[PDB]
Write an enzyme that holds these catalytic residues in place. Structure first.
Site, PDB file in Angstrom:
ATOM      1  N   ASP A 421       0.639  -1.591  -0.350  1.00 21.09           N
ATOM      2  CA  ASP A 421      -0.110   0.453  -0.109  1.00 21.09           C
ATOM      3  C   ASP A 421       0.846   1.490   0.537  1.00 21.09           C
ATOM      4  O   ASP A 421       0.655   2.240  -1.009  1.00 21.09           O
ATOM      5  CB  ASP A 421      -0.572  -0.153   0.962  1.00 21.09           C
ATOM      6  CG  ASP A 421      -1.753  -0.944   1.342  1.00 21.09           C
ATOM      7  OD1 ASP A 421      -2.143  -2.402   0.295  1.00 21.09           O
ATOM      8  OD2 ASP A 421      -3.045  -1.040   2.341  1.00 21.09           O
ATOM      9  N   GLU A 493      -4.619  -5.714  -6.967  1.00 20.25           N
ATOM     10  CA  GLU A 493      -5.756  -6.370  -6.743  1.00 20.25           C
ATOM     11  C   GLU A 493      -6.801  -5.940  -6.181  1.00 20.25           C
ATOM     12  O   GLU A 493      -7.372  -4.680  -5.456  1.00 20.25           O
ATOM     13  CB  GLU A 493      -4.845  -6.786  -4.785  1.00 20.25           C
ATOM     14  CG  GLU A 493      -4.097  -4.572  -4.422  1.00 20.25           C
ATOM     15  CD  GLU A 493      -4.598  -4.716  -3.027  1.00 20.25           C
ATOM     16  OE1 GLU A 493      -4.545  -4.999  -2.076  1.00 20.25           O
ATOM     17  OE2 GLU A 493      -2.851  -5.075  -2.668  1.00 20.25           O
TER      18      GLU A 493
HETATM   19  N1  LIG Z   1      -2.626  -4.586  -0.131  1.00 22.03           N
HETATM   20  C1  LIG Z   1      -3.659  -3.778  -0.326  1.00 22.03           C
HETATM   21  C2  LIG Z   1      -4.952  -4.698   1.432  1.00 22.03           C
HETATM   22  C3  LIG Z   1      -5.037  -5.759   0.967  1.00 22.03           C
HETATM   23  O1  LIG Z   1      -4.439  -6.490   1.909  1.00 22.03           O
HETATM   24  C4  LIG Z   1      -6.310  -5.850   1.766  1.00 22.03           C
HETATM   25  O2  LIG Z   1      -6.646  -7.291   1.854  1.00 22.03           O
HETATM   26  C5  LIG Z   1      -7.366  -4.804   1.139  1.00 22.03           C
HETATM   27  C6  LIG Z   1      -8.498  -3.977   1.816  1.00 22.03           C
HETATM   28  O3  LIG Z   1      -8.517  -4.391   2.937  1.00 22.03           O
HETATM   29  C7  LIG Z   1      -8.103  -2.797   1.080  1.00 22.03           C
HETATM   30  C8  LIG Z   1      -6.783  -2.808   1.039  1.00 22.03           C
HETATM   31  N2  LIG Z   1      -6.023  -3.642   0.398  1.00 22.03           N
END
Ligand SMILES: NC[C@@H]1[C@@H](O)[C@H](O)[C@H]2[C@@H](O)CCN21
Length: 850
Positions: A421, A493
């Site tokens: 993130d 993701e």
């Molecule tokens: N690595 C980014 C993370 C993930 O690890 C997590 O499962 C998902 C959500 O909580 C929004 C943020 N995103």
């Protein structure tokens, strides 16, 4: 040359050990200690001994007393040594969170040195070791993922009672003479033509004897002889660089479907005094990888000079890090059966064998560090994870070195994400880059999975705008909203959230009352979704299901409508990104579905579930990612052909037909003679016009036939005259709400049709069985057999898993026949004869023998 993994341990709480020094002395009593296999967390070990009930079921996990995991636990074994002529070493990683290490009563290392899940250690224990029985014990300390440079579970599941404390990779007992051999690898460079490669073999030697020596490091690389002789002072380590080695016509490693997956061998011996002292065997691939930013600023991967749309999912290991080599191969095979090319690993970076396997299958891997805990604690603000102190920096740096050293020769690895993130700051980034440099890790470094850039490497070229919960299929076709998760740039993701598993899995993971609550009240919290409040329930999903498919009549109705919804959404999620990959401006360059699989039994963020069963989300992804594929654009009604194969295809016919739910054809189009280029390029067959007279819910049948007349893709859509629209202005981070809902509820009243089934099974010489199933719409009307799901089951009607179908969840029009193949391990029948269970939306259920 000896490296022998420790088979197993007895473990016990440090609550029961009052003198530490006594654990590692030969003869220490272990009455009541728990026997565990290698790679066990504490809880994994107690589960192995049947101490607590199955945490995959209901709230079983809630019932484990967590307090006992806030103190150290010991891992102890004996070690027979027939001779002290050879020196002795402990070489290992995977300690969560940190440990003291004891051999025969002597503390050989503390938890200040042995700290960090990913840090490798190479402990010379020659001084402590004697002939006969020796003992070794680790005192492993509690794990806190926000405090320790370790592993944690974010919001994927629920917190494991022990927080994975323990030793989750092998500890090697190494023997060797005066010289230890370490860190052998092969730097490989391919010319742009891919017909010549240059190899640089590097290998460390360490003289741990008290006397100066000459050592010869000799062996073979890719079938070629090599040999170097160097001097070592006592206690000196040298890196030996071998002269360049030319390799003509290398057997280039390719992603699955683009060629072979050959790995070459490196095999080395360090001798001293014309006598072997240590030896190491390894493998490498000859493959070039690049990940660059395009003119739109999107991250673009290419392998051996061929650009690729990354199509994959976020992989997780078992919630308690329980390792099994076959399971890992089985999970990776599913990636291919889904037609995906890639798995992302957000932290939880698996043992080596996982990458050998990915290498052998040609599944691309995207490993990296995880968000939302210690790793990002210095940069991520109010997000969980503690700000770093000075002692953290070397652990972090050493962790990168150790991982970079593990991964550098695995052809499947395409990049390393140094942030998830949040991108690292300058100091932390420089520590990662230096570590990678020192390891000759030469792969692309992605600074973050979000849009956030790093100070050195710069822009990520990726986006993490969500969604992570229910959005309607057309959302995925958005290119207008720059803070959203439409098909453009690189989606590191994302998904549509809830993914209700099969009825068989459900009945294994949840109680009757829990299941009752699921369909009646989707707003209620579910232990088997997530620990996070944002994702603790199924409300958004529940609301959209009810609105779009109609209110649920009962549990069976809910689950049947869930699979359609999941197939529908995941299909569109992938299909949109495939189409937009060849856009001139702001193309999609990647899509990682959140997630491929779950750490445990789950209700969300999965394609295949904890038991390897296969649901609507599974089949939807599989449909979208067929090698030669026909699809329907939810945004603009375009019928698009996608060619995922490595060669251009010609003389294709694309046939599109619409049907009302009474089976009346309302539109037909036949587009003959299409060509489509290789590796993700597309062609447009037709834009379906606005057809008058459609039932509010209707059907679209897309069929693709090659120049031989073979049907190569079939794709059936349930559409609505009533559009899905989005309330963009009302978005938050994890989803965009709907201003209006499609009406697919027509499907509730689709007339019954029939099938139509015959099955036979061949037991191969490779330990696998193939069950073939021929299905025919046998109905005497005009109604299609819609969404027909076939399962290989045993005599008790229990699914045989894992399993791999060429195709499934099929729709056949009256008279039509398809033949399906399911492959699986013959032993996974456990002696039963095979049957096939066959359930259609509008065809009821039958089981036939196989
Ligand atoms: N690595 C980014 C993370 C993930 O690890 C997590 O499962 C998902 C959500 O909580 C929004 C943020 N995103």
């Amino acid at each position: 040359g000896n490296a022998t993994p420790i088979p197993g341990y007895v473990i016990q709480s440090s609550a029961q050990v009052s003198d530490d020094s006594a654990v590692s002395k030969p003869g220490f009593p272990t009455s009541g200690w728990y026997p565990v296999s290698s790679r066990s967390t504490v809880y994994a070990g107690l589960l192995q001994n049947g101490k607590y009930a199955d945490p995959f079921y209901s709230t079983n996990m809630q019932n484990v007393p967590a307090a006992q995991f806030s103190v150290p636990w010991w891992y102890r074994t004996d070690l027979n040594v027939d001779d002290t002529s050879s020196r002795t070493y402990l070489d290992f990683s995977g300690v969560l969170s940190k440990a003291d290490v004891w051999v025969n009563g002597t503390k050989v290392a503390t938890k200040d040195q042995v700290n960090g899940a990913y840090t490798r250690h190479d402990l010379d224990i020659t001084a402590q070791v004697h002939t006969g029985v020796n003992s070794v014990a680790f005192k492993v300390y509690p794990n806190d993922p926000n405090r320790d440079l370790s592993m944690g579970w974010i919001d994927w599941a629920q917190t494991p009672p022990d927080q994975n404390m323990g030793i989750v990779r092998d500890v090697l007992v190494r023997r060797s003479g005066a010289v230890a051999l370490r860190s052998a690898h092969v730097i490989q460079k391919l010319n742009s033509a891919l017909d010549h490669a240059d190899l640089t073999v590097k290998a460390d030697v360490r003289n741990d004897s008290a006397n100066a020596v000459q050592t010869t490091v000799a062996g073979t690389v890719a079938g070629k002889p090599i040999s170097q002789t160097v001097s070592l002072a006592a206690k000196e380590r040298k890196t030996v660089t071998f002269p360049l080695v030319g390799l003509d016509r290398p057997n280039v490693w390719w992603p699955a479907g683009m060629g072979g997956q050959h790995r070459y061998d490196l095999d080395l011996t360090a001798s001293v005094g014309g006598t072997p002292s240590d030896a190491a065997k390894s493998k490498f691939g000859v493959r070039d990888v690049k990940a660059t930013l395009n003119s739109s600023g999107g991250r673009q991967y290419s392998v051996n000079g061929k650009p690729l749309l990354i199509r994959g999912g976020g992989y997780t290991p078992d919630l308690f890090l329980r390792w099994n080599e076959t399971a890992a191969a089985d999970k990776l095979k599913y990636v291919l059966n889904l037609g995906l090319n890639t798995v992302r690993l957000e932290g939880h970076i698996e043992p080596d064998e996982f990458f050998d396997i990915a290498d052998d299958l040609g599944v691309l891997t995207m490993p990296g560090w995880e968000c939302c805990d210690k790793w990002e604690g210095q940069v991520n603000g109010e997000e969980k994870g503690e700000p770093w102190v000075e002692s953290d920096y070397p652990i972090a740096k050493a962790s990168m070195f150790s991982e970079a050293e593990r991964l550098r020769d695995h052809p499947s690895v395409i990049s390393f994400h140094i942030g998830s993130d949040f991108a690292p700051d300058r100091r932390i980034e420089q520590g990662y880059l230096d570590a990678m440099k020192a390891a000759d890790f030469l792969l692309p470094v992605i600074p973050a999975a979000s849009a956030r850039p790093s100070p050195i490497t710069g822009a990520s070229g990726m986006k993490m705008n969500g969604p992570y919960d229910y959005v309607p299929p057309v959302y995925w076709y958005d290119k207008s909203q720059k803070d959203r998760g439409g098909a453009w740039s690189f989606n590191s993701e994302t998904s549509a959230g809830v993914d209700i598993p099969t009825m068989d899995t459900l009945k294994r993971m949840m109680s009757a009352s829990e299941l009752d609550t699921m369909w009646k009240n989707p707003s209620a919290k579910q232990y088997h979704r997530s620990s996070s409040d944002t994702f603790g329930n199924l409300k958004l999903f529940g609301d959209a299901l009810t609105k779009r498919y109609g209110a649920s009549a009962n549990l069976n109705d809910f689950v049947r409508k869930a699979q359609l919804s999941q197939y529908e959404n995941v299909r569109a999620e992938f299909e949109s990104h495939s189409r937009n990959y060849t856009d001139s401006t702001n193309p999609s360059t990647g899509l990682i579905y959140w997630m491929l699989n779950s750490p445990w039994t789950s209700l969300h963020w999965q394609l295949f579930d904890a038991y390897m069963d296969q649901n609507g989300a599974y089949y939807g992804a599989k449909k979208a990612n067929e090698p030669l594929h026909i699809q329907y654009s939810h945004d603009n009604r375009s019928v698009v052909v996608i060619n995922q194969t490595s060669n251009a295809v010609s003389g294709l016919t694309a046939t599109t037909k619409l049907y009302n739910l009474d089976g009346t054809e309302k539109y037909s189009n036949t587009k003959t003679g299409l060509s489509v280029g290789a590796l993700g390029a597309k062609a447009t067959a037709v834009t379906v016009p606005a057809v008058s007279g459609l039932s509010t819910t209707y059907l679209a049948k897309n069929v693709l036939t090659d120049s031989s007349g073979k049907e190569v893709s079939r794709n059936v859509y349930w559409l609505s005259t009533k559009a899905d629209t989005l309330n963009w202005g009302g978005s938050d981070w994890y989803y965009t709400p709907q201003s209006a809902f499609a009406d697919l509820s027509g499907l509730n009243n689709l007339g019954q049709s029939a099938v139509g089934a015959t099955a036979n099974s061949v037991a191969g010489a490779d330990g696998t069985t193939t069950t073939t199933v021929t299905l025919k719409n046998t109905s005497g009307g005009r109604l299609p057999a819609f969404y027909v799901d076939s399962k290989v089951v045993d005599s008790a009607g229990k699914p045989v898993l894992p399993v791999e179908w060429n195709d499934n969840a099929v729709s056949l029009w009256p008279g039509e026949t398809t033949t399906l193949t399911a492959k699986y391990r013959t032993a996974d029948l456990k002696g039963s004869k095979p049957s096939v269970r066959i359930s259609g939306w509008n065809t009821g259920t039958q089981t036939v023998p196989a």
